[PDB]
Amino acid sequence: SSIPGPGYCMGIGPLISHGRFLWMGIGSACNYYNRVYGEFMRVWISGEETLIISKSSSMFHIMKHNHYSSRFGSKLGLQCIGMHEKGIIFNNNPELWKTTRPFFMKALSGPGLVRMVTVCAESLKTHLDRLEEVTNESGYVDVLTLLRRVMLDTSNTLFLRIPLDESAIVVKIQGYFDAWQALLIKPDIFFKISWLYKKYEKSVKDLKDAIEVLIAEKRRRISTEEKLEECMDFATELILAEKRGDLTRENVNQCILEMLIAAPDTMSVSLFFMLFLIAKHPNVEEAIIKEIQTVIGERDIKIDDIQKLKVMENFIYESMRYQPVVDLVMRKALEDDVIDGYPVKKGTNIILNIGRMHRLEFFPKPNEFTLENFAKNVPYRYFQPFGFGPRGCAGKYIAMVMMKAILVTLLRRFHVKTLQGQCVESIQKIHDLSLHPDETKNMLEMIFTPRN
Ligand code: HEM
Numbered sequence: 057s058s059i060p061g062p063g064y065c066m067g068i069g070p071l072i073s074h075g076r077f078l079w080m081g082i083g084s085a086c087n088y089y090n091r092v093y094g095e096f097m098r099v100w101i102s103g104e105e106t107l108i109i110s111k112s113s114s115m116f117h118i119m120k121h122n123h124y125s126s127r128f129g130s131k132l133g134l135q136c137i138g139m140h141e142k143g144i145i146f147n148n149n150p151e152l153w154k155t156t157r158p159f160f161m162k163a164l165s166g167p168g169l170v171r172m173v174t175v176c177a178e179s180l181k182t183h184l185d186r187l188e189e190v191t192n193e194s195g196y197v198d199v200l201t202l203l204r205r206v207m208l209d210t211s212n213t214l215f216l217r218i219p220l221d222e223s224a225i226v227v228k229i230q231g232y233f234d235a236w237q238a239l240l241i242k243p244d245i246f247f248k249i250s251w252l253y254k255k256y257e258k259s260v261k262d263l264k265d266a267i268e269v270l271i272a273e274k275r276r277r278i279s280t281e282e283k284l285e286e287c288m289d290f291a292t293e294l295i296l297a298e299k300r301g302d303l304t305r306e307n308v309n310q311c312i313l314e315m316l317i318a319a320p321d322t323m324s325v326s327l328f329f330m331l332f333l334i335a336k337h338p339n340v341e342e343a344i345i346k347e348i349q350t351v352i353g354e355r356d357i358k359i360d361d362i363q364k365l366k367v368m369e370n371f372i373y374e375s376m377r378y379q380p381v382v383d384l385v386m387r388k389a390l391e392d393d394v395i396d397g398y399p400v401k402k403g404t405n406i407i408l409n410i411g412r413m414h415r416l417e418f419f420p421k422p423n424e425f426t427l428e429n430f431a432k433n434v435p436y437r438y439f440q441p442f443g444f445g446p447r448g449c450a451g452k453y454i455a456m457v458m459m460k461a462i463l464v465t466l467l468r469r470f471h472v473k474t475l476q477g478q479c480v481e482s483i484q485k486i487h488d489l490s491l492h493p494d495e496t497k498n499m500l501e502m503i504f505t506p507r508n
């Protein structure tokens with residue numbers, strides 16, 4: 057089979073599609089092209105032929121196999137943000153990615169996952185006691201800021217544990233994400249004119265310098281530690297691996313940064329959407345509250361509770377299915393292969409449109425929010441909110457633990473109200489690297505009213 061998509065109009069075909077991606081944003085452009093052309097089609101970003109695919113069968117093949125364990129993006133963009141062959145997220149060097157990933161995998165499962173449930177709860181408790189930091193005169197809570205601050209505090213106390221300026225680093229992480237999202241698919245021409253990206257360069261430096269202060273302190277505490285194996289964490293694991301010569305200092309520093317930004321970037325927006333959904337679905341709220349009463353009572357949340365929280369689990373799954381944040385996954389072909397019916401040469405970029413896939417393929421009621429979509433056991437080959445296989449979400453299991461832990465401890469204490477008629481559907485969204493609220497708009501606040 058030949059490949060669907062717009063015509064290569066003697067070099068105008070590539071320029072319109074790239075231009076469309078730059079104007080619309082990656083996400084919306086992906087949804088445009090899948091709607092106009094097939095659910096498996098071809099576009100160009102820069103020179104390279106890039107495939108945009110929403111087919112579940114294609115999705116499954118790509119994530120299953122090792123020869124897709126790469127992403128893509130502007131070399132100049134990735135060098136600017138420090139992700140070019142340095143972290144794991146957009147580390148496209150297969151061998152360097154292979155040797156860096158285990159550090160993330162170990163920290164995000166096993167005992168660290170068990171510690172996280174209680175770390176999350178305590179971190180949210182402490183911030184819910186300090187609601188004055190985040191609440192308006194008219195009682196409006198800045199939930200986005202609240203969630204970002206707990207997510208950072210959570211990540212720090214588990215993976216690094218060095219005291220930091222919580223409020224400042226949060227703003228800096230937001231700055232970093234903007235830079236990341238801005239520069240990721242900009243053409244090489246964009247980087248020639250310097251009064252057009254130096255804005256983002258400063259944002260990257262702001263965060264990287266701030267994290268440097270923290271890693272420097274961490275390095276000192278490690279060198280003067282008696283019981284070194286008694287208090288191991290993610291940052292220490294990397295620093296010792298560097299000392300063995302397995303890792304580069306620059307690489308270590310990017311890993312720590314990537315670990316710290318991950319939850320503030322994705323978890324907080326996800327939980328925000330989840331909280332807006334609770335506010336507008338009172339029947340679903342009741343089920344969750346009754347489940348909390350049955351399973352937990354007024355005991356502290358524990359690791360043994362998380363499996364039992366089935367209703368909430370289904371809620372989290374449905375929220376992610378219906379209103380995703382990470383609705384697209386970027387990959388690259390490392391070997392030639394035939395996929396479904398189409399030829400896919402090595403060096404071909406892939407964008408998997410998982411958001412659209414979750415509205416087309418398996419679910420009974422795809423275009424409405426219902427826990428009925430998860431009333432029967434969902435095959436993981438039709439629902440992929442995290443990705444799977446050798447390059448699936450490193451935090452995929454811990455993320456479920458964290459989301460449960462904070463939803464339990466928040467809803468236990470407060471009823472959530474939305475301002476005016478606002479819902480996830482009415483929120484003005486940016487649909488670029490991720491699907492998130494346009495924060496230049498207002499009416500994003502909530503009202504937290506006590507329970508009992
Ligand atoms: C609701 C929250 C989250 C969602 C929806 C999410 C989703 C995803 C998805 C779809 C990917 C791409 C996987 C693929 O290519 O198949 C990814 C990658 C990744 N995630 Fe998450 N994730 C979440 C939370 C987290 C957390 C809490 C962490 C760690 C603190 C994390 C760390 C990572 C890392 C390091 C990668 C890059 C993996 C690699 O390229 O090897 N994620 N995530």
Ligand SMILES: C[C@]12CCC(=O)C=C1CC[C@@H]1[C@@H]2CC[C@]2(C)C(=O)CC[C@@H]12
Nearest residue numbers: 145317318321322382384385386489490
């Ligand atoms: C989950 C994630 C990493 C942790 C973080 O800090 C923020 C994000 C949001 C963008 C994700 C990314 C992982 C890689 C993804 C799936 C892509 O291939 C395109 C969009 C992108």
